[PDB]
Scaffold this motif. Structure first.
Motif, mmCIF file in Angstrom:
data_model
loop_
_atom_site.group_PDB
_atom_site.id
_atom_site.type_symbol
_atom_site.label_atom_id
_atom_site.label_comp_id
_atom_site.label_asym_id
_atom_site.label_seq_id
_atom_site.Cartn_x
_atom_site.Cartn_y
_atom_site.Cartn_z
ATOM 1 N N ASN B 2 11.392 1.088 1.697
ATOM 2 C CA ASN B 2 9.762 1.118 1.787
ATOM 3 C C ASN B 2 9.625 0.029 2.848
ATOM 4 O O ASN B 2 9.715 -1.070 2.707
ATOM 5 N N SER B 4 6.428 -0.872 3.781
ATOM 6 C CA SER B 4 5.481 -1.733 3.359
ATOM 7 C C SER B 4 6.068 -2.933 2.504
ATOM 8 O O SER B 4 5.360 -3.923 2.549
ATOM 9 N N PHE B 5 6.907 -2.599 1.781
ATOM 10 C CA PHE B 5 7.751 -3.859 0.834
ATOM 11 C C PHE B 5 8.367 -4.936 1.899
ATOM 12 O O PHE B 5 7.848 -5.907 1.625
HETATM 13 C C1 NAG Z 1 5.952 0.844 -1.042
HETATM 14 O O1 NAG Z 1 5.314 -0.312 -1.657
HETATM 15 C C2 NAG Z 1 4.014 -0.291 -1.639
HETATM 16 C C3 NAG Z 1 3.215 -1.535 -2.157
HETATM 17 O O2 NAG Z 1 3.722 -1.766 -3.458
HETATM 18 C C4 NAG Z 1 3.397 0.943 -2.479
HETATM 19 O O3 NAG Z 1 1.934 1.061 -2.454
HETATM 20 C C5 NAG Z 1 3.938 2.185 -2.189
HETATM 21 O O4 NAG Z 1 3.680 3.115 -2.943
HETATM 22 C C6 NAG Z 1 5.564 2.154 -1.702
HETATM 23 N N1 NAG Z 1 5.924 3.396 -1.209
HETATM 24 C C7 NAG Z 1 7.358 3.771 -1.387
HETATM 25 C C8 NAG Z 1 8.009 4.863 -0.648
HETATM 26 O O5 NAG Z 1 8.343 2.919 -2.243
#
Ligand code: NAG
Ligand SMILES: *[C@@H]1O[C@H](CO)[C@@H](O[C@@H]2O[C@H](CO)[C@@H](O[C@@H]3O[C@H](CO[C@H]4O[C@H](CO)[C@@H](O)[C@H](O)[C@@H]4O)[C@@H](O)[C@H](O[C@H]4O[C@H](CO)[C@@H](O)[C@H](O)[C@@H]4O)[C@@H]3O)[C@H](O)[C@H]2NC(C)=O)[C@H](O)[C@H]1NC(C)=O
Ligand SMILES: *[C@@H]1O[C@H](CO)[C@@H](O[C@@H]2O[C@H](CO)[C@@H](O[C@@H]3O[C@H](CO[C@H]4O[C@H](CO)[C@@H](O)[C@H](O)[C@@H]4O)[C@@H](O)[C@H](O[C@H]4O[C@H](CO)[C@@H](O)[C@H](O)[C@@H]4O)[C@@H]3O)[C@H](O)[C@H]2NC(C)=O)[C@H](O)[C@H]1NC(C)=O
Ligand SMILES: *[C@@H]1O[C@H](CO)[C@@H](O[C@@H]2O[C@H](CO)[C@@H](O[C@@H]3O[C@H](CO[C@H]4O[C@H](CO)[C@@H](O)[C@H](O)[C@@H]4O)[C@@H](O)[C@H](O[C@H]4O[C@H](CO)[C@@H](O)[C@H](O)[C@@H]4O)[C@@H]3O)[C@H](O)[C@H]2NC(C)=O)[C@H](O)[C@H]1NC(C)=O
Ligand SMILES: *[C@@H]1O[C@H](CO)[C@@H](O[C@@H]2O[C@H](CO)[C@@H](O[C@@H]3O[C@H](CO[C@H]4O[C@H](CO)[C@@H](O)[C@H](O)[C@@H]4O)[C@@H](O)[C@H](O[C@H]4O[C@H](CO)[C@@H](O)[C@H](O)[C@@H]4O)[C@@H]3O)[C@H](O)[C@H]2NC(C)=O)[C@H](O)[C@H]1NC(C)=O
Ligand SMILES: *[C@@H]1O[C@H](CO)[C@@H](O[C@@H]2O[C@H](CO)[C@@H](O[C@@H]3O[C@H](CO[C@H]4O[C@H](CO)[C@@H](O)[C@H](O)[C@@H]4O)[C@@H](O)[C@H](O[C@H]4O[C@H](CO)[C@@H](O)[C@H](O)[C@@H]4O)[C@@H]3O)[C@H](O)[C@H]2NC(C)=O)[C@H](O)[C@H]1NC(C)=O
Ligand SMILES: *[C@@H]1O[C@H](CO)[C@@H](O[C@@H]2O[C@H](CO)[C@@H](O)[C@H](O)[C@H]2NC(C)=O)[C@H](O)[C@H]1NC(C)=O
Ligand code: NAG
Ligand code: NAG
Lengths: 334, 334, 334, 334, 334
Positions: B2, B4-5
């Motif tokens: 991820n 974003s993480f």
């Molecule tokens: C990645 O992490 C964000 C923040 O917690 C979350 O909103 C998102 O759905 C996640 N995406 C995946 C593909 O894990």
């Protein structure tokens, strides 16, 4: 010990701090002490009349606004914070080109002390301008200086003093000049009164005495030996005109070759030098020897006895005159 | 997986991070392991007394402010993030002009490990000064160093070491200097106590032995051959005055010309070296041969038997003296 | 095609975009095609063992994060937007001094396509390093390359391929060089296993053949002419020894002068060269000619028949020996 | 004497100050006084027709937007505030390369007066271009100028003038040049009308006179002596054909050597110069002397009285013709 | 003209202006009219094959996004505002190092007109690559072109034209090259079809004819005189073998010396040139003269009548053959 507490203290110090205002603004001038640690003198060039100097340059003063308490340790901060503090407008009066090293970071150090004392160090490689008198070259003895002065402020705003007296400038001992040899370095502090007003001024002056062994071996000796060889023509039978002519003209050619190639090797400094005077003296000597031989051959047929007398007189006069000229030359230039 | 993480983790790590604070500030000094991977050595300028070097310079340490959890894979960040972290104020003590290659992007690498380990790499080219004692040149062996020191911090805050023992520096064998030939390189980890205090020091020093074949074929051999040719005049009857005079004087002229052109072609290092002593010895020899012929010619009229005996003595004296001179020279410079 | 709509779409794409994170993070490696259009190989300096190059370098790679829809056109954005994107850390392993032109603006082109693909072009003048083998100079055949490699990423994250196959490099034909004619350029793609895993590597190499006409007409021909003139002394009445002595010694002097001046003109790489071997061979030949004449003159009075036999045999041997030496030289080096 | 009050006043002065608008924009042009204090003239290279200068450049004017009251002190601000003000678009018309020294800081002074008068000072080292007509070299007399103009504005927006009259430029005496010697400097202030409009224009001109002693010692005297030596063969018995042949041909060789070496050492401007004419005249004279000897030798076996008459007439003609040529040379070029 | 109103107008114009979007993005191409005012051409280098050029580069176009109303007077802004607008990605195709002069302010001008017209002026010095052919050197004539082209945009988005027709380029008359003399200059407005599409291309070409008088005085005339002197041996009695041998060999030595010194002085361009062919011809001539004399000496004793016939025939054959060679050469290259 507490990183966050130190960060808070530093931020509080920076808050309300106007870099555009010198410390003690509107009050007595702030004194600045300067220490120079000469890492090495890079290269001295007479062609450009300049010497490259690498050094550590440190300035030392006190800013009340930066005074902090509660943290006894001296704060040697990162270099990037130096942009956020007032610093002296120090510059070098006669640097043709200068810069501050930046690998792997800018060679710049800021150190704060609890009493507000600030120490600021830089590593500078500057090509300073040193006008040289080369009349007595290569027996010259140059005096090259580095000047330091405030740019905008005056004596009423800032004053320069050497920090440590005669011990302020270090590293002179370890300087290795392949051609020169440092004799004496001096520090001078004074004030220069421009029409605007008085400014601080610091001067670090070296005197360099040029080594002479290389020029004696490689420059003077060939000329002396050629001049001596030119005298071989005197101890030659007058009938053998061909050999004497060949010897004289070949010695003249050799003298010309060495003179021109020395000029090519030596710096293109365009005015008279002692080496030039000596070389032209030797050239005049060999030319006169050839002219004397020509006169001998010309009057040889009519008065052979007078020709022989002239030849044997020259056998003494030429070495004697050359020795006298050499004595005069060495006395004049030493 | 991820992105974003990872972005959230990076923003959290950089949030509140103070670049002005070294890792473990106020505590134990932070160890720094430095590796150098030399690409190649560009040039060794004797005139400027410096060598040009290109290397991958990597620094390895630990910062607890950057430790992260949940992401097993290491973070290979963009070089611009290096402007936002903390890095050691490493600098080179004997450099004159260094820079970081920036094509296409700046050659800067930041790699963060989960345990807070930081690896910071640059590609650096530097012109390091190296004082050379060229008295024994071209038969000389030089020793050129590279000194690494922390500009601002002391041993209380930072400690240097070679990450990998003597394997820290690589690529020495891949260096291919046409002129010199690398003999041995050494890594030294010490402390230097300046007036301010103790600083770490990492010194990587090479010893280079200059190749000699070029000067053997190009410089010494012509001089030896001209010296030999100068001895031809001995096997000439005294009647051929023009022949012997021309031969001797032209050998002298040839010696002067080759000496001057060698001086101009060779570096202008202005002090006496071995090659100069050799050339002046040969020149003295040809001068002595010409002078001997002149003396024989002068005394031949009065004592022809004595003159012939002197010439036949010279025929063997001159090569013997030259051989002794060569033996003395090549023992004193080997 | 609304300008405001396009601006909003571009801002949205740049919104939430992290430069520090490569595309396909924690997944498949991002392939990066590369194209080079060489404008001009400026110079090939043997003294510095380098060559200056100017080219258009284009990196082409897909990027899902930058995919846009609704606009048929391929956006061609200002160079100043490239700082807000992610670009591969491409660099060159052996560029001593490389830079990107910036007049009148940075020669940087960014183009985006609806499928998310990105094209990134730069105009680069780089001084690459080419180690030459001059043992067969000036009949050499250099192989000068340019290496292209990722800096901080490995083959697990990024892959380099020549976009366009063997045609990915253009403009090689239009390259003009005063001294060289390009024989062949080659493209190689591979992976190099360093300490830190594998690394992609793209090598573009040229083979350069040196022009020989200038050296033939300017170096070998005068040496041959003087060598021939050396043999002139053979067809000379040995009784007039002065003329033969002058001829031989002056030929030697001329050979020395031309040798020194060719050394001065030719590059100063200090080791053996074919041209140097040829010049020393010619010098040895003229020296042997003068020595033979001297020996003949010495033995001329003991037995004229033997002297004449030696002279007439030399008249045959020396041209024959010289021709044999030329045959050996031109066959060994060709 | 209030630090925060002065900070408030400065912020108020910068409050709403539009840099992009000139003072009194849309009204009368802003008069700008200029002063130059010349530190030194680095060098005057005729190879590139350029001379390097270093000086302090000060611009003095008025801006109503920067007028303060209540603070009697002249606010001497930090250099970094200069980026937040307006300054004239002054530039130099013929600066091939110029820069402002930034060690230890950018030598940039900003001073504000109560009446809104601003003084702005810079330390500039520049490389002005100065086309030279060296036909009369080395006896030439150059006129080298520095021109100052507004890049974007016209006479309707700004009007340059010299501040303080002709005393606006100082330090002329302190300039020291090894080769030249300043004769006179001039200040010109005017307007130049182009197609776009009228631009204010300032000009500081120097007239440099070259020193002649060095070339007299180095170049002319050797040639004169060689000519006199060439004349020697006139006072040689025509029987000694070899002697005269050697003398004439060796003088020719010497003249060629000195001619080539002086041409190399002297600047490489590729067109005719007075010294070139002089050297070619000397070469012509020595060639004529050798030709005369050749003619005498040829006709000698037929009419020896005529040959002796020709030789004795040459004895008078050649010095006389050479003296006439020298008179012409030293009259036309002086 | 009101300062506040003008500032409001400028802020309104910059409100929402997008630099990344070209004027009329996605619509018709924007025409750009370019003027060049050349200040001077510094140098033309055959070693580097490039010419230095300093000029004012003015682009002229219209962006309606910046159109303003209510201000009849044209606006001139600080160069810094150029960082906030759209300017064409113009560059020069055949440059090697270009830079915008930045003293004092950056030499850059932005002017706006009520109709949205933008005038953009730069002061640029660049070293443009000009592939010079020097087979006919120094009788050559070079054609040096400066190309101008957009980088990212194509003819679909932008079109180039000369604003002023053939009067677009000015100042060609004022150019002063001591080495050359400008003959003609032309402007072309082509389109180039690269693989990425059609680009505008404005070419400015000069034809420069080399001044030749310097080479006639300094290079050809000495060679001619030496060749003439080589014929002196013809008018010498064959008995005086020593004199003729010395004359021939010394003339050969002088020819070699002047050829080598010319090689050193001439640019290092390594391929055959006209001057090299001429010097080689002269050298072959003197070599053949010496060989002919040697053959005459060898055959003299056996057939003195044939020797005299050959000696008297050469006195016409050699001058006639040399004159024929000179006629062929000077008609081939003129
Ligand atoms: C990645 O992490 C964000 C923040 O917690 C979350 O909103 C998102 O759905 C996640 N995406 C995946 C593909 O894990
Ligand atoms: C290279 O050459 C330069 C000169 O071109 C040398 O620099 C000079 O060095 C000398 C000392 O060797 C300096 O002399 C000193 O000047 C100081 C300033 O004097 C001015 O101000 C005072 C008032 O403060 C006035 O009275 C005076 O008239 C001047 O206007 C003095 O303060 C110094 O005094 C010290 O020495 C004297 C004895 O000489 C003592 O009596 C004093 O107590 C005190 O100790 C001194 O006179 C001179 O100023 C320097 N030149 C410049 C331009 O500043 C370099 O030294 C030289 N290089 C080397 C290596 O030697
Ligand atoms: C080019 O020239 C330079 C000098 O100009 C040479 O550099 C020297 O290299 C030698 C090694 O070859 C260095 O000697 C070593 O110094 C180390 C540091 O000593 C300091 O720190 C220790 C504690 O760690 C103190 O005890 C000491 O007093 C110093 O303060 C030592 O740790 C090394 O010890 C090694 O040798 C000893 C015996 O002598 C053994 O007992 C040890 O186990 C160990 O093997 C060593 O003494 C020297 O310091 C360097 N010079 C400088 C100025 O630092 C280059 O080597 C030369 N180039 C080449 C190719 O040789
Ligand atoms: C100047 O000098 C350089 C070398 O210093 C030359 O560069 C070499 O060029 C040759 C080709 O002419 C290269 O040889 C090729 O190497 C490729 C890479 O092999 C490595 O990687 C693969 C995996 O990708 C491994 O399997 C392999 O073991 C290696 O580790 C090969 O893929 C090529 O094989 C292809 O051709 C051969 C026949 O030659 C076929 O048998 C194969 O099936 C296949 O089609 C090939 O072997 C060599 O690698 C280059 N050097 C370097 C260091 O990469 C320049 O060419 C030279 N300049 C000029 C103008 O010639
Ligand atoms: C190197 O070479 C340059 C030229 O290339 C020389 O510079 C010239 O210097 C002279 C002065 O010595 C300049 O002449 C002056 O020009 C001024 C401008 O002229 C314009 O304006 C006037 C009205 O003010 C008009 O009449 C004229 O047509 C122009 O439109 C004049 O104002 C000056 O006038 C002064 O002298 C006259 C008498 O001659 C008086 O009546 C006036 O009151 C006033 O005192 C003067 O004529 C010339 O312009 C400069 N050249 C250039 C191109 O500008 C350098 O001097 C030279 N170097 C050295 C060391 O001499
Ligand atoms: C140094 O050397 C270069 C070449 O290496 C010279 O540059 C050439 O300059 C000439 C003009 O002097 C150029 O010729 C002109 O090209 C124009 C553009 O042609 C393109 O576009 C047209 C349509 O607009 C197409 O038809 C054509 O195929 C091209 O795609 C033409 O418009 C010109 O035509 C005009 O002149 C000709 C006669 O020359 C007339 O017949 C026409 O009716 C019309 O009036 C013309 O053909 C040439 O293109 C340039 N070459 C390059 C490679 O750029 C330099 O001039 C030279 N240096 C000097 C100082 O001369
Ligand atoms: C926009 O980009 C696409 C993708 O590269 C271009 O489509 C290519 O067009 C060329 C002809 O111009 C074809 O040969 C390729 O096969 C096409 N590739 C693909 C993937 O479709 C398109 O032409 C570009 N358009 C513009 C205006 O730049
Ligand atoms: C185009 O953009 C302009 C500016 O935002 C807007 O006023 C207009 O309504 C838009 N038109 C369309 C069709 O999107
Ligand atoms: C000095 O300035 C501060 C801050 O504006 C103000 O509070 C104080 O009253 C001033 N004092 C004087 C004497 O002006």
């Amino acid at each position: 010990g507490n990183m966050s507490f130190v960060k808070e203290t530093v931020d509080k110090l920076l808050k309300g701090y106007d870099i555009r205002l010198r410390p003690d603004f509107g009050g007595p001038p702030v004194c600045v002490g300067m220490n120079i640690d000469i890492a090495s003198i890079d290269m001295v060039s007479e062609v450009n009349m300049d010497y490259t100097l690498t050094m550590y340059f440190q300035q030392y003063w006190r800013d009340k606004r930066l005074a902090y308490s509660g943290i006894p340790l001296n704060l040697t901060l990162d270099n990037r914070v130096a942009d956020q503090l007032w610093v002296p407008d120090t510059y070098f009066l006669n640097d043709k080109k200068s810069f501050v090293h930046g690998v792997t970071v800018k060679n710049r150090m800021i150190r704060l002390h609890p009493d507000g004392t600030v120490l600021y160090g830089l590593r500078i490689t500057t090509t300073a301008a040193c006008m040289m008198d080369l009349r007595r070259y290569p027996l010259d003895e140059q005096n090259c200086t580095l000047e330091i002065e405030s740019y905008g402020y005056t004596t009423d705003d800032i004053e320069f003093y050497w920090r440590g007296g005669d011990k302020a400038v270090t590293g002179v001992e370890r300087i290795e000049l392949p051609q020169f040899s440092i004799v004496e370095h001096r520090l001078v502090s004074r004030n220069v009164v421009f029409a605007t007003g008085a400014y601080p001024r610091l001067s670090l002056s070296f005197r360099l005495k040029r080594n002479i062994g290389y020029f004696i071996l490689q420059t003077y000796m060939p000329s002396i030996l050629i001049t001596i060889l030119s005298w071989v023509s005197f101890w030659i039978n007058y009938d053998a005109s061909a050999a004497r002519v060949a010897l004289g003209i070949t010695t003249v050619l050799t003298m010309t070759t060495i003179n021109t190639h020395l000029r090519e090797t030596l710096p293109k400094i365009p005015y008279v030098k002692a080496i030039d005077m000596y070389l032209m003296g030797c050239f005049v000597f060999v030319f006169l020897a050839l002219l004397e031989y020509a006169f001998v051959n010309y009057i040889f047929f009519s008065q052979p006895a007078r020709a022989a007398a002239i030849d044997r007189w020259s056998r003494i006069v030429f070495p004697f005159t050359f020795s006298l000229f050499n004595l005069v030359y060495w006395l004049y230039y030493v």
